[PDB]
Amino acid sequence: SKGEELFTGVVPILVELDGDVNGHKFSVSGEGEGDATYGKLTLKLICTTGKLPVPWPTLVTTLLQCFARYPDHMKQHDFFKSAMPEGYVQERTIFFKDDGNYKTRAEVKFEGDTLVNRIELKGIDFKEDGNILGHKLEYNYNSHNVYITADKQKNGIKANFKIRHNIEDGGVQLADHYQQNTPIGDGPVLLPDNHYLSYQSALSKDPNEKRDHMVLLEFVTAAGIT
Ligand SMILES: [Zn+2]
């Protein structure tokens, strides 16, 4: 099982994100582990530049779908593991309704025994007292299904999905996600049948940590084979 063998145990994870939203620069550094057997991802993400100038929930989708649990019946549809260890590029555009947009490029690959995600994020067209730069989003997260389809012509996959962020005063901030993933290698990859990834996301704090940070626990399971 090419790539899948790399994910049979607990894999250490490093995340490094360099961000600029409306000219406000920030870096995020993350450490944790992934246990694909259980679809389990645990990360502690730290803003190393001081105060994060956007809400932590707006970066959850950006901050390792190779840790999704594909049931045994669906192992032929797992593109993300098939691209390893050479890895893949994930690009997203995220449009916040009635606000700005994020454009992200991430390179997901192994460095020795460690799965690394090097991410660059650029945000433009935000309102200074909107929900994002105004910090008006709740520190919580809704379950959602991500529909995956083959992009046969780009030897990869695509996905589009809607995230609803809870606004403090009540109401929801829509974030429309458009995603493409392409392998880094010329190694063969699995191009899947349509399916979805079911996400459950839990956000918390390390009570001992004084820097601006997010503890992220997520469980991701492939489904949607009719
Ligand atoms: Zn088929």
Residue numbers in the entry: 2 to 64, 68 to 230
Q: What's written in the study?
A:
Venus is a yellow fluorescent derivative of the classical Aequorea victoria GFP protein. Amongst the various mutations introduced to generate this yellow variant, two key changes are the introduction of glycine at residue 65 (from serine), which is thought to influence chromophore flexibility, and tyrosine at residue 203 (from threonine); Tyr203 π-stacks with the chromophore causing a red shift in excitation and emission into the yellow region. In situ synthesis of the chromophore is critical and occurs through the stepwise covalent arrangement of three contiguous residues Xaa-Tyr-Gly (where Xaa can be various amino acid residues), with only molecular O2 needed. In the case of Venus, these three residues are 65-Gly-Tyr-Gly-67.
To incorporate a photochemical switch into Venus, we replaced the chromophore residue Tyr66 with the aromatic non-canonical amino acid p-azido-l-phenylalanine (azF);34,35 effectively the hydroxyl group of tyrosine is replaced with an azide group. The most significant differences occur in and around the chromophore (termed CRO). Electron density fits well to a cyclised chromophore containing the intact azide group present on the P ring. Further analysis of the chromophore, including comparative estimates of bond distances between the refined structure of im-Venus66azF with the refined Venus structure, reveals several novel features that provide us with insights into CRO maturation and the role of molecular O2 in the process. In im-Venus66azF, the backbone carbonyl of the strictly conserved Gly67 is twisted ∼180° out of position compared to that observed in other FPs (b and ESI Fig. 3d, e†). The O2 molecule lies between the twisted carbonyl oxygen of the Gly67 and the hydroxyl group of Tyr203 above the plane of I ring element. His148, a critical H-bonding residue to the mature CRO, exists fully in the open-gate conformation. A channel leads to the chromophore in im-Venus66azF that is only available if His148 occupies the “open” state; when His148 occupies the “closed” state normally observed in mature fluorescent proteins, the tunnel becomes blocked.
